[PDB]
């Protein structure tokens, strides 16, 4: 009835909505109304898949978050420590997914609104990667406090540096799509050093049977595949116009984020059972 609109082709878009020239049709027009943007969630356009991937994913980690947070304290060795450390992971996860599906909804509002939620969606990715190291580094170096605090300092200065760069207007431009890929991929590349440290500090066999050696492989693959699909727009690059709505590169990257954070939680969980289990106690 009120607030009607129709999708427009790529050529009649403003400059701040031309982020992917391989998506030819199905774009929402510039609508400076939040009521129209939130109602577009239930309509078909180029952002429908991007919205629902992290809208549903935010519920997945809102459920996983308050389930782990409300686990009875008589099951943790240090309830205050282990929950605050786990809280940083779900906090960065809820912030990342919320700042993302909100960005992809109000993406067609105006230039100021898109510019604002773009920096939040970028900073949310860094918050997730930073928050992912907090539980992983806690149990990996449960008996070695020196590398546990040193690696926390490095991840902090690397993630804050990424957030600082994310606040630059030329960072979000289409010409720096490979740059945005390399930044948050290099942020995950930092975790290779503590992964090898934990492998040589413990037994090389323990790095496989205890916890998951495939954790690093599953994570590194989803990091590489996520960055590659994002920086190259693989599904649409081959056949532009055939992936305007579904199975575009940004959608597969959205799912890989939820899947990788899901694997990391499942990895830290079994990494936790080893720390307060025998043969996993502190040694010299």
């Amino acid at each position, epitope marked *: *009835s*009120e*607030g*009607r*609109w*129709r*999708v*427009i*082709p790529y050529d*009649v878009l*403003p400059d701040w909505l031309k982020d992917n020239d391989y998506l030819l049709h199905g774009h*929402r*027009p*510039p*609508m*400076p*109304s939040f*009521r*129209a943007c939130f109602k577009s969630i239930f309509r078909i356009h180029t952002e429908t898949g991007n919205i629902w991937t992290h809208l549903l994913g935010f519920v997945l980690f809102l459920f996983l978050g308050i389930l782990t947070m409300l686990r009875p304290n008589m099951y943790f060795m240090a309830p205050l420590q282990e929950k605050v450390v786990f809280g940083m992971f779900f906090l960065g996860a809820v912030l990342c997914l919320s700042f993302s599906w909100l960005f992809h909804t109000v993406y067609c509002h*105006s230039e100021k609104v898109s510019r604002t939620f773009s920096k939040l969606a970028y900073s949310g990715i860094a918050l997730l990667i930073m928050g992912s190291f907090v539980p992983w580094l806690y149990y990996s170096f449960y008996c070695s406090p020196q590398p546990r605090l040193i690696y926390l300092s490095i991840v902090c200065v690397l993630g804050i540096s990424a957030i600082i760069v994310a606040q630059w207007d030329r960072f979000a431009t289409p010409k720096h799509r490979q740059t945005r890929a390399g930044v948050f991929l290099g942020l995950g590349l930092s975790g290779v050093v503590p992964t090898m440290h934990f492998t040589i500090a413990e037994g090389f066999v323990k790095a496989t049977t205890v916890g998951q050696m495939g954790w690093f492989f599953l994570m590194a693959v989803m990091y590489i595949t996520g960055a590659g699909l994002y920086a190259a727009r693989i599904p649409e690059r081959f056949f532009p116009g055939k992936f305007d709505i579904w199975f575009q590169s940004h959608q597969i990257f959205h799912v890989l984020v939820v899947a990788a954070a899901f694997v990391h939680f499942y990895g830290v969980s079994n990494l936790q059972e080893f720390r307060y289990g025998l043969e996993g106690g502190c040694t010299d």
Partner: antibody, heavy 118, light 107 residues
Framework: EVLLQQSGPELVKPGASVRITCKAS????????MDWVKQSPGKSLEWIGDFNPNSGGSIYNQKFKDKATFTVDKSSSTAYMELRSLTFEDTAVYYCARETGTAWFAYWGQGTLVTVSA | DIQMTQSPASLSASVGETVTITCRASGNIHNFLAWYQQKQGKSPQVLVYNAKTLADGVPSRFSGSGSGTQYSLKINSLQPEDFGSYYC?????????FGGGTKLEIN
């Protein structure tokens, strides 16, 4: 470039009908909606309705529900408006305007003056 | 039916001065407003759409502002060729409606 060419001026006696043409070119005709505006001489613009050529739907202004009728010819990228039972109050210039997602008109036709006299 | 109301109606100014045309809507239209300039005997041309977005090719002197129910169209330096008729329209409500119009004279 995008151009909207309309039919020539109309001079008809009262009680007759007329059909106004809007020939579109320079874009995919089915991608946008086409509206119709009425401007009486010395008066302001009146929105008659819009038309979706892709789906065939049309939403009329209740002031013109028994006055105008929208038609299309996708094979020629052309739109039509049909005014019936013309009186002196219908003597005006009728425009066809194209939308761009939302109903803000960046392209207008040159106008078709329909004059009703006796 | 959301009805628009233009305040100036008949505007007169000199060359170089700043003028403003306001357009008050009866109901909220959520910045779905467009401004048009019409010359004598010719079709109108859009100046500002979506309340503030300047249309392509329009001089920088034309500015759009407002929110909710009150909106404005400001002209920085009035030019001798800016005379004509100016209209505001809303494309939020089901029956789209234009304003009363504002004739602009240059002395």
């Amino acid at each position: 470039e995008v151009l909207l060419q309309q039919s020539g001026p109309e001079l008809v006696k009262p009680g007759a009908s007329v059909r106004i043409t809007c020939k579109a070119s320079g874009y995919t005709f089915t991608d946008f909606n086409m509206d119709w505006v009425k401007q009486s001489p010395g008066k302001s613009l009146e929105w008659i309705g819009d038309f979706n050529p892709n789906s065939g739907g049309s939403i009329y202004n209740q002031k013109f529900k028994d006055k105008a009728t929208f038609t299309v010819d996708k094979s020629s990228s052309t739109a039509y408006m049909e005014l019936r039972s013309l009186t002196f109050e219908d003597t005006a210039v009728y425009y066809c305007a194209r939308e761009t997602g939302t109903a803000w008109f960046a392209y207008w036709g040159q106008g078709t003056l329909v004059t009703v006299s006796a | 039916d959301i009805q628009m109301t233009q305040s100036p109606a008949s505007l007169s100014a000199s060359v170089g001065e700043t003028v403003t045309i306001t357009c008050r809507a009866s109901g909220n239209i959520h910045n779905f407003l467009a401004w048009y300039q019409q010359k004598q005997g010719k079709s109108p041309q859009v100046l500002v759409y979506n309340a503030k977005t300047l249309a392509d090719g329009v001089p920088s002197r034309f500015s759009g502002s407002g929110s909710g129910t009150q909106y404005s169209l400001k002209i920085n330096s009035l030019q001798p060729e800016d005379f004509g008729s100016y209209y505001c329209q809303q494309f939020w409500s089901t029956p789209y409606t234009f304003g009363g119009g504002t004739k602009l004279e240059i002395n």
